[PDB]
Swiss-Prot record, chains A, B, C, D, E:
Gene3D superfamilies: 6.10.250.1180
UniProt-recorded name of the protein: Fructose-1,6-bisphosphate aldolase/phosphatase
Residue numbers binding dihydroxyacetone phosphate: 18, 133, 266, 297
Entry's family note: Belongs to the FBP aldolase/phosphatase family.
Residues the entry annotates as binding beta-D-fructose 1,6-bisphosphate: 18, 91, 104-105, 133, 242-243, 266, 297, 358
Pathway, per record: Carbohydrate biosynthesis; gluconeogenesis
UniProt-annotated binding residues for Mg(2+) 3: 232-234
GO molecular function terms listed in the Swiss-Prot or TrEMBL record: fructose 1,6-bisphosphate 1-phosphatase activity; fructose-bisphosphate aldolase activity; magnesium ion binding
Protein function: Catalyzes two subsequent steps in gluconeogenesis: the aldol condensation of dihydroxyacetone phosphate (DHAP) and glyceraldehyde-3-phosphate (GA3P) to fructose-1,6-bisphosphate (FBP), and the dephosphorylation of FBP to fructose-6-phosphate (F6P).
Domain topic, free-text comment: Consists of a single catalytic domain, but remodels its active-site architecture via a large structural change to exhibit dual activities.
Cofactor(s) needed for function: Mg(2+)
Length: 389, 389, 389, 389, 389
């Protein structure tokens, strides 16, 4: 049968600050989705956080961009906001609900969406990812690696079924333009775009052999929605695995280097992306509690839950960063975080001026006496003597 | 509404030695505060230890320095002492109850107090800290960093709402004098005082833009109360976060370097301040069990519990050192503790002579034959020959 | 009394991918073996996974190569397949069931078998091992060490009862030939064979003093069964300990170096063998849940469960890699995995061409224009100019 | 007496590539400056490289911005170019000679200039720095620290002579505007500017107590001169030490964190600034040979030569990174370089798009078919099917 | 002008064993090449070792495959053999002189050859590499990376002049066939071949834009020449840098991971390729002394000498692994060598059976009693009892 897998995610309040979610928010969301399942709106679901972001993973047969699914998520977020976040006066209550009026699609309103629709395969393993304290382009390097780097994905070389490569759908979020680039041949041009992680984001990946959907990344940029910094984007990502798609382990290998990503404190820094364990996973209650954000509101973290689909039912989730091999990766991230923080507010630890334009900093800087440089050279001695006296 | 948040802390016995508390002490204290809540004396509470010190976190509407609140804490400590510590003959039963007669304020009696009163904000995140095996000045470096170091608190630079700085209320605990110093302009003078951690302690911090209370640190010095060493002070600290105050993560960043602090064994050493996880946190029972003190009666440790206030109710606590990023910090502390302990009883691992004057050491040293140096030079050969024979 | 200990193992589906098993598969298998025990088919059992492989450990009095025991395992695997794996559409449902027709012995059908029959000693400690993401020859180095390396097994030198050495039964899986070699005298020749881990596999070890069975390793090679790569072999191993056999700790010492083994991603790589803890061990339910495979579908892992036999009953299992001493070994493995993965698809991280012949790679390589080298030298300039234009 | 200290630096060819200089270039430059000294054009000099950049350190009494001094440097660089670099066909022969016509000041022509004029103190210690593979803003963090960070410069707190702070002259190299900001009071605003290292560069620092010159950094931006990437800027910096200025060790402390800086390969990356030893220092010949650039054309490195001035004579240089304490710092840099390089061409390892506009990359990216995003959503299936077929 | 650069290398005796060369061998070779230069046979030269292999780097205008050049090298090696190696009875005197009769080309006789002919560019930086204790395929991973891995060579992405890619000439040394593959499009197929490092060796690389020669690797396989193991091949490699070819630093970056390579002890192991400093470099005498081979006859090492060509003259060499950044890489190699050596003679530390066929091992193994496996199963008890008695 054909199934749609949708992740719709939002921050509707933190506990405390931006560190985490309140567990009653997850319980409320799970109860609401259980009711939707009973009414036949969805087939199955799983609710989980990473940091202060709540992901609603839903399987259904309504297709992508469906108003009922998108609306169910919106309503769930609004009810969590009103019933839980406002009640406990959580920080950033309703943070990502950036627009008032739901008119059918949740894109552009603040919540993140990643979805794919496909014929369910004879085995259908999928991985759901969620990151906090970063942007959607944080997934650019992992997505490139798992679909186009033969040092990551051995299948590109050694599995005859994969050797034709992949099609990357890249969104320019500034000019609202889409690029379609094919690996291996277009790898260099692809990289020239997606290395600019804040602008050119991999949104979807398709297999070249047949066009099958392979991955879907959420591309909402909160600062472009709001016109100012109101949070990190905090993306979600779906990847289908195996059988001419990257193995589960090839997908995970793509996260084994905890690369520097943009976000962290105040949406204004760069730090390592730590692949983190969940605190708890409860398959029967359909809830997982992900990691906290601590020093400097991070470091940024990503969680990975694996599932097997059957008739759209979700067996899972399985925490796929739960291995002593990944402890080494977490330790690296911890040490890199310490190293880079000693830079304080200097680029490249602090972000470039184009992202700083969304913060209050240009404000502040607009008290302050420039002097024209040519004239200043003549006057330097008198200006210095004025400061001295 | 206006709310007061009070932490009143005391060691009333250890289990064993000074290593930890007995869990029935926390259960007794929680039960007593539940009764106070039922009678309307307080709104909410949380009870927890770090090492051998019990913190009573209470929210109420009675204001700072209130005899009913202070008295409720005193009575709770006295009852724990009598009912639990004496019964099990715990070590240092009633340790910090240094005076007999409660006359309305618990300051000067041995228990530590940190309190602030404010209009509860639309979201009110707060962090409660407790340290064991150290002095109140152990919080001087973190407090300076989170309110005045742009390498810690990015908001000083990049958040226009924070750029006016902070007012530090510094207590000279020896001469009983208060200094008010404003950052950024007074940073150097501030540091000249607060670097002398045993004498000049940050007691309160206020936002300069509006005067809002930002932090309150407990400044009781047990040795000055008793006139002799009877324990480490073991401070408690309240910090309000976000919205023109340091972010939760900026506050936590201030503890990411496990700096050397005074205390540890016998109140007479210096060692790293380890940011430690709680052993357990039970929000429903309102109890958290903090870490033990082990090698050399430490190393010194600090715990961090975050809360969100609503109508004075405390949602929380959340262990804010619970992140693999902080494992790196704990490992550093562990290694520094090993390194410094190889010094044995030599300064600067052993504390200066002004703190040693509170111990029994001057006693001992007063057997022992000084010779006037000028005369000794003439006589050296005969003295050495006398020792030899 | 005489007892037989049999481990019969198979992968009948993964959760997700090849990462792990679904816990209902273990519960189903345990329930089936409980029924067999009630009917007197077996004495006792234990069910556990490492990665995506399910081991059925069974004690009974039917001897080695018994059709009833082998059939009970086959049937259990077929029922797990049909009832659980197919139902949840697990990945590789029925993966290791390579032949259709059970005719009395499970060898050659895909499941791995290790068995020994002996008079149960006055104390009968045994260790069951299971590895995932590797081949049976992964156990060649540990088996050599525990029975023939005096740097591992001190008993060879210092215990007079062990000094006569051991008999290794080595199977050449390609030519179907058996070698019998005796240590210490034949050590060099033994090593010349078993260093070729994919071809010459230690199948059984016997004590030289009396012929007692000491160890049994499972030698099924899935690629030779199927004629193509269909998975890693994923061996199981039984070792009897103590009393003129290696001590439990000597057996474990043999795994303290996490040596490179063949398998890992796509059966086509080499990586360190990590000695891993079980996630959980439940002696009363007779189930242990072993580790997951994550980065790059590994690294390869081995688990160790110890038991004491009494009248064939299995007291245990005990996780024998559960010690901080082995954390060092896991950390080493984690770091070696990171190091070697930076090689990508180059030998020796990628496996030799004789194992690659079982994959799809020769396929792919057969598009592609060889030129005879002597002729190419004359024509090189024209060929390069053709590519350029 | 009054003396001027001038560093005039240029890359006029590398050996090989951009790795180093040819030693005959230094010998030629030293011989030319010896002749100038004999003719009374300058008092003293020292010639040295870091990487592929040659610094001419000259002491004289001609003042800042002097046509004779600037001309002597220009001529020396032109002669090295013609006589040595062209002869040996070195890479980038004459690299930094960006304009043809010397009209009196070398600024704007490609060579870097840092100069200060002052009354020579009763002791006049100075430090000359040179960095390769980076920009002038690489010195922003060290300069801030040594003059404004009390965690670096203890003198700000504990030396009464320093407590009034410093005046930073900050150049906006894009709009040609100068800011004058005073620490401690203007620290936050200062940081808001100088954290944007490619735009707002500390050019000069003065003591607030008296206006004395403290430091001078070279601010030429080759890309703004040429209109395209032609190299990294590769700055030089002079700092006067002691006696109410930072101690030699406070200046050096400012380089003890090997912070990330912009430049490295192709002027397009970020990497750690390694404080490197000179290969050799020959005070009598007036030549020092600095470090090579190797992996990835770096990592970026800084060298530090100390001198004592007497009547303008230069006693020195002394390699001030030559201490086992700095080996730790180099090791950190080496490890950070390895870590960050695994990112490849992704921000923040790759530089932002505003610096990439100076490279050939926008060129390349301008082949490549954007689709308008709204329309693409309708057409996605047909486009993917077109790629597939 | 057009110039040819030739490296002709041979081991003609070790000092002691295979550890190093005797310095008089280098002095003799340099003196012989100085005479050739005086007679106009060559333009310039440089003589150096890595381990026990002597590289003769020669520039000339005689073209590739020239009998005079090849003959000059042969004669030099024969004279070093006769005059020095035989005299001091060095180990392996004349080791690589495998054939008796020089008939015009040194290929197939044992010495390694890498050559390229080109128009000398306006700047012509080149790097000469030499490795000991390994095979020519050891350079496969570095060559792939520097010409085809965008994580190594940023120029593939960010330098418009490089974006068209490269042509790899791959030699199948077993079947004597040449493959021509173009990156980026043929990367996966390329890797499928060159990952089999002992069979498919990159021999030459050309720029796709114009056909310019980029690199030449020496592909002689001593075991295929001799029909048995007589040494490791010990390759040499020439790479031209810059100006639409990889930068010097991109070439070096390709060696920054010390990947496992085949060779080491007895041509029969795998170990990390350490990028090593030269012991000494003397540009005036035209001699460099490279590193020794020590533990286990290694680990394998590579040295890198950079040059700038002018009218065919060689300015250089410059040791390009001489940087503290590369100390980290050497330390990694040292630790990996220790780790892997604990495996002893087991694959994958020991090499596969196809390389072992060239050693004496099959000899030895051919004493030793196979039993047919089916029959052995019936007889196992009697065979074991026979061994026991
Ligand atoms: Mg939030
Ligand atoms: Mg978030
Ligand atoms: Mg967010
Ligand atoms: Mg106590
Ligand atoms: Mg205490
Ligand atoms: Mg105390
Ligand atoms: Mg499987
Ligand atoms: Mg398996
Ligand atoms: Mg398997
Ligand atoms: Mg240059
Ligand atoms: Mg330079
Ligand atoms: Mg430059
Ligand atoms: Mg040799
Ligand atoms: Mg050799
Ligand atoms: Mg050789």
């Amino acid at each position: 049968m054909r199934v749609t897998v949708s992740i719709i995610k939002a921050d509707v309040g933190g506990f405390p600050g931006h560190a985490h979610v309140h567990p009653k928010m997850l319980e409320y969301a799970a109860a609401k989705l259980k009711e939707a399942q009973k009414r036949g709106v969805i087939i199955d679901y799983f609710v989980y956080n990473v940091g202060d972001d709540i992901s609603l993973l839903m399987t259904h047969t309504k297709g992508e961009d469906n108003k009922d699914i998108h609306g169910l998520a919106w309503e769930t977020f609004k009810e969590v906001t009103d019933q839980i976040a406002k009640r406990f006066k959580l920080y950033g209550a309703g943070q990502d609900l950036l627009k008032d009026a739901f008119s059918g699609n949740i894109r552009g309103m603040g919540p993140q969406v990643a979805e794919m629709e496909f014929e369910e395969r004879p085995s259908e393993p999928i991985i759901a990812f969620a990151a906090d304290k970063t942007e959607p382009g944080a997934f650019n390097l992992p997505l490139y690696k798992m679909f186009a780097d033969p040092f990551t994905t051995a299948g590109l070389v050694i599995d005859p079924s994969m050797h034709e490569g992949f099609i990357f759908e890249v969104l320019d979020v500034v000019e609202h333009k889409v690029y379609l680039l094919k690996t291996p041949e277009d790898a260099y041009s692809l990289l020239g775009l997606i290395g600019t992680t804040g602008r050119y984001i991999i949104r979807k990946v398709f297999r070249r052999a047949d066009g099958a959907p392979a991955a879907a990344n959420s591309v909402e940029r909160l600062s472009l929605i709001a016109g100012r910094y109101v949070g990190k984007d905090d993306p979600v990502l779906l990847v289908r695995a195996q059988s001419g798609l990257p193995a589960v382990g090839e997908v995970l290998e793509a996260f084994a280097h905890p690369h520097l990503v943009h976000g962290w404190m105040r949406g204004s820094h760069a730090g390592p992306l730590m692949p983190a364990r969940f605190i708890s996973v409860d398959p029967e209650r359909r809830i997982a509690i992900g990691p906290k954000m601590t020093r400097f509101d991070g470091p940024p973290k990503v969680g990975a839950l694996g599932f097997q689909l059957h008739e759209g039912y979700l067996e899972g989730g399985v925490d796929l960063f739960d291995d002593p091999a990944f402890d080494y990766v977490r330790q690296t991230a911890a040490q890199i975080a310490d190293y880079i923080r000693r830079m304080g507010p200097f680029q490249p630890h602090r972000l470039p001026p184009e992202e700083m334009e969304y913060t209050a900093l240009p404000k502040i800087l607009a008290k302050v006496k420039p002097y024209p440089a040519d004239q200043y050279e003549k006057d330097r001695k008198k200006y210095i003597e004025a400061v001295v006296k």
